[PDB]
Design a protein around this nucleic acid. Structure first.
Ligand SMILES: [Mg+2]
Ligand SMILES: [Mg+2]
Ligand SMILES: [Mg+2]
Ligand SMILES: [Mg+2]
Ligand SMILES: [Mg+2]
Ligand SMILES: [Mg+2]
Ligand SMILES: [Mg+2]
Ligand SMILES: [Mg+2]
Ligand SMILES: [Mg+2]
Ligand SMILES: [Mg+2]
Ligand SMILES: [Mg+2]
Ligand SMILES: [Mg+2]
Ligand SMILES: [Mg+2]
Ligand SMILES: [Mg+2]
Ligand SMILES: [Mg+2]
Ligand SMILES: [Mg+2]
Ligand SMILES: [Mg+2]
Ligand SMILES: [Mg+2]
Ligand SMILES: [Mg+2]
Ligand SMILES: [Mg+2]
Ligand SMILES: [Mg+2]
Ligand SMILES: [Mg+2]
Ligand SMILES: [Mg+2]
Ligand SMILES: [Mg+2]
Ligand SMILES: [Mg+2]
Ligand SMILES: [Mg+2]
Ligand SMILES: [Mg+2]
Ligand SMILES: [Mg+2]
Ligand SMILES: [Mg+2]
Ligand SMILES: [Mg+2]
Ligand SMILES: [Mg+2]
Lengths: 32, 115, 67, 233, 134
RNA sequence: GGCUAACUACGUGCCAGCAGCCGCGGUGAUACGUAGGGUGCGAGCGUUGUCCGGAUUUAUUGGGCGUAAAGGGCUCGUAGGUGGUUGAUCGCGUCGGAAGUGUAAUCUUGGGGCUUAACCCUGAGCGUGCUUUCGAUACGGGUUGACUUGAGGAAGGUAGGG
RNA sequence: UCCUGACGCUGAGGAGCGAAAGCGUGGGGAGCGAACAGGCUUAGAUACCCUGGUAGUCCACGCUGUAAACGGUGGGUACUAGGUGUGGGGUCCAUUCCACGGGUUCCGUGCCGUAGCUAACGCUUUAAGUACCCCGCCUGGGGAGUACGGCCGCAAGGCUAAAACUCAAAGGAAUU
RNA sequence: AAAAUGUUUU
């Protein structure tokens, strides 16, 4: 493994988790 | 040396060096060398005139050449098959193959005398 | 290596018996390592357990400190 | 030959081998008795194998005969050279180098260079004057070439067979020999391989005389064959 | 656990032949003995023998002694199991397999006992294609 | 231009444009445009669309999973798949005959007719199966009985931060 | 030695267990220490470093069910050179009539290494070799383990799991 | 002991 693959997946996951954190309230008001 | 049963391969073989797999089967006279460039060059230099060769695995020329080489080295000439099995060629090997070997040898005799 | 440290035999361990436990406790009061005490694994385990029991039960010092 | 059968072998101590620490597994059939750790050669089939080696060297000398006596161990340094010089048979004794058997062109070039220098250096040192550190360095190069090359002088072409002592030390010789398809006859103890030797002679290889009697008997065989070549011609 | 004793026989023979062993041994079964017999009759092994149990005292032991020619040359170029327990292969009298262009032999269990392809074709009988020994 | 059979000049100057991929064009462009020459085909020749091939690139024939994409975090266990040695028996799988059927055309092939061919007629094969029926019993399976070597248990011995 | 007499293996779905962090109720709280406050460094320092320091770390009962949960190597079985450490149970030998020692046998656990395998690195009886049985999984790189739906959860989230679009590479080992 | 960066040629 070149660790680059893990870094790419790491950034994608971290960005999605940040999106979930910032939109936590709206999802529980109407949605998942 | 490569065992030719009358201008064709003795029996089907599958060779592989590294990753270059090459399949060879004998063909009826007049079929030609149905082979890819590198394997076809190897067979044409070896003198096989009726053969069906397929290149499985990697297409690198060097590795395909080595795979054709050990596929040909895996060939097992009928007399030495008989020696291996402790029997006779008439007892081990197909009558059609032996016959075709005689007609090839005799046509060879014709060519030699004509010279 | 460790074969030159010949295997030593002790028989019964008997945490009450302070003589063997003193022979296997270090001059500072610690338990000696296996490669220096020359014991089998089972005998070393029994000696360590007996030393701990004697320590808790006042027959041996937890650390002899000053020599 | 007869070599008084097993009497000479037992008196010399050929039956000695190596202990259990290191061993070639292809010696399972070749086990007599586990005596004091050192493995024991039965020394019975040894007579048959040395007889077969004698027969092959007779056949090789009948077809003309060129045996290269290769040796490097301190137990054979002072033994190989004397018998090889007595029989007039090519030998190498110090630092069998990578090549020779495969570097034929380079080694022949060095043979010609040694042949010319062995005359021109002597002529220059005995005749016209010459400055120091030039004649000295040419003489030193001559000495190094003489040390690293002995009986290799006399070979017109590729040899016919190679005689190996302590194949573990002289491993490269057998690789070159198998690459160029020359017959090999070698002393092998309980740690060597029969796959890389065609005419295999088991026996000890750690004593000076243990290889010395074998090299002497094969030297006698070579001398007898060279004598018979006069009538063979 | 053991699933295909015939495949075990074939792999034992292949491994022993590759390692240049003179003899190989295995627990005995009737079909194993038959295959060993036809292997001997076709010249792929030197001989075979069924031994009454005397070490484990439990069951018969089938032992195959192999043959290597001049300059230590394999008499078996390979052996392959065809009718696997997971997927069984049956061949008709007309669709009998050819091994190594006819140089090798397929071992076929027919209704008339174990018969090499050549035999079966002569008798016009098919069956279960056990092996492709060549 | 290469794959791909067949090259030069003039014009243009990352412009105009080309391209299926690699790429070409920035001032000596065999890759753009034209011309000469050439090459492949030819009453056709190209382009686009679609399908199969090449692609073993879903691998039954015929692939893989340490690091290339790929071993479930681990175990228990249901259905299912699979089964050590051997006697007897059934004859479902399997194998071999027989009968029936698989229209014709198509397709393969032997003859024949259109001036040849395409096309057409005709004989056979094929129709890779199915049903019925008669056999074979080596193997798979069913039924049934043994054997202990796999597996489990008893008794004794026994190691351990389970 | 004894007993049973193939009772075996694997196992979709399902169920349970599952580091740490996290969550709920209650308790506890020395040390440590996200967040936080201050001091330094710095162009800035929402950091490294320093002084403080709350959740947490701990306990009870639940929940969550994820890890580079890795040997990145599913389980079972048979076979295929050795060499050499070490852990466990036997048994044998000589002097003992202990044990030191050697063997030998059965089961672990390392290292070296042959055949063989692999793109190479390497693996090599603890296989990544030769084979058979069953399960899980892969099919270019991104988009994406994301959206929609559904299930699970108190929540965090987990599980199942695309497509449009886009690139002609992404990648493995090794060489200089 | 901390001590950053390196557009578009043709
Ligand atoms: Mg491959
Ligand atoms: Mg061209
Ligand atoms: Mg121009
Ligand atoms: Mg396909
Ligand atoms: Mg396509
Ligand atoms: Mg693939
Ligand atoms: Mg696997
Ligand atoms: Mg991966
Ligand atoms: Mg795992
Ligand atoms: Mg899971
Ligand atoms: Mg079941
Ligand atoms: Mg069975
Ligand atoms: Mg029966
Ligand atoms: Mg018709
Ligand atoms: Mg006509
Ligand atoms: Mg029809
Ligand atoms: Mg049955
Ligand atoms: Mg018990
Ligand atoms: Mg009973
Ligand atoms: Mg679950
Ligand atoms: Mg916790
Ligand atoms: Mg809490
Ligand atoms: Mg609380
Ligand atoms: Mg701090
Ligand atoms: Mg872990
Ligand atoms: Mg994983
Ligand atoms: Mg599993
Ligand atoms: Mg496995
Ligand atoms: Mg072990
Ligand atoms: Mg692999
Ligand atoms: Mg999700």
């Amino acid at each position: 493994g070149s660790v680059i693959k893990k870094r790419r997946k790491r950034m994608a996951k971290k960005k999605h988790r940040k999106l979930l954190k910032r939109t936590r309230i709206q999802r529980r008001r109407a949605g998942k | 040396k490569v065992p030719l049963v009358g201008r064709t391969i003795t029996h089907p073989v599958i060779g592989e060096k590294a990753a270059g797999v090459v399949m060879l089967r004998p063909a009826s006279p007049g079929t030609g060398v149905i082979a890819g460039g590198s394997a076809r060059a190897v067979l044409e230099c070896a003198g096989v005139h009726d053969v069906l060769a397929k290149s499985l695995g990697s297409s690198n020329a060097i590795n395909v050449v080595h795979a054709t080489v050990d596929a040909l080295q895996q060939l097992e000439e009928p007399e030495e098959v008989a020696r291996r099995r402790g029997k006779s060629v008439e007892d081990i090997a197909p009558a059609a193959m032996l016959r075709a070997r005689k007609e090839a040898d005799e046509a060879a005799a014709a060519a030699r005398m004509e010279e | 290596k460790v074969v030159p440290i010949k295997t030593v035999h002790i028989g019964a361990v008997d945490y009450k018996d302070t003589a063997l436990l003193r022979k296997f406790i270090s001059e500072r009061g610690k338990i000696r390592a296996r490669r220096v005490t020359g014991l089998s694994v089972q005998d070393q385990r029994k000696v360590a357990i007996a030393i701990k029991n004697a320590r808790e039960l006042a027959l041996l010092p937890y650390a002899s400190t000053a020599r | 030959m007869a070599v008084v059968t097993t009497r000479q072998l037992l008196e010399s101590g050929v039956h000695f081998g190596h202990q259990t620490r290191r061993w070639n597994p292809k010696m399972k059939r070749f086990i007599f008795t586990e005596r004091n750790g050192i493995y024991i050669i039965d020394l019975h089939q040894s007579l048959t194998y040395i007889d077969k080696a004698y027969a092959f060297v007779k056949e090789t000398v009948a077809k003309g005969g060129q045996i290269l006596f290769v040796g490097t161990k301190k137990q054979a340094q002072e033994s190989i050279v004397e018998q090889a010089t007595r029989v007039g048979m090519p030998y190498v004794n110090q630092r069998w180098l990578g090549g020779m058997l495969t570097n034929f062109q380079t080694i022949s070039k060095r043979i010609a260079r040694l042949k010319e220098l062995e005359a021109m250096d002597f002529d220059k040192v005995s005749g016209s004057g010459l400055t120091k550190k030039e004649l000295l360095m040419l003489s030193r190069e001559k000495d190094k070439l003489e040390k690293d090359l002995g009986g290799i002088r006399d070979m017109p072409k590729v040899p016919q067979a190679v005689w190996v002592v302590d194949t573990k030390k002289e491993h490269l010789a057998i690789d070159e020999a198998r690459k160029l398809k020359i017959p090999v006859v070698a002393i092998l103890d309980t740690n060597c391989d029969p796959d890389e030797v065609d005419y295999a002679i088991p026996g000890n290889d750690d004593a000076i005389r243990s290889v010395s009697l074998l090299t002497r008997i094969i030297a006698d065989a070579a001398a007898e064959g060279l004598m018979a070549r006069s009538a063979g011609k | 656990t053991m699933t295909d004793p015939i495949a075990d026989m074939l792999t034992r023979l292949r491994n022993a032949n590759q390692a240049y062993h003179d003899q190989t041994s295995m627990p005995h079964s009737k079909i194993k003995a038959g295959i060993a017999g036809i292997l001997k009759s076709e010249g792929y092994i030197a001989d075979y023998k069924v031994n009454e149990p005397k070490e484990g005292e439990v069951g018969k032991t089938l032992t195959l002694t192999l043959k290597y020619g001049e300059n230590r040359e394999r008499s078996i170029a390979g052996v392959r199991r065809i009718s696997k327990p997971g997927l069984r292969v049956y061949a008709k009298s007309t669709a009998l397999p050819k091994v190594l262009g006819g140089l090798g032999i397929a071992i076929i269990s027919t209704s008339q006992g174990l018969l090499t392809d050549k035999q079966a074709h002569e008798k016009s009988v098919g069956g279960e294609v056990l092996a492709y020994v060549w």
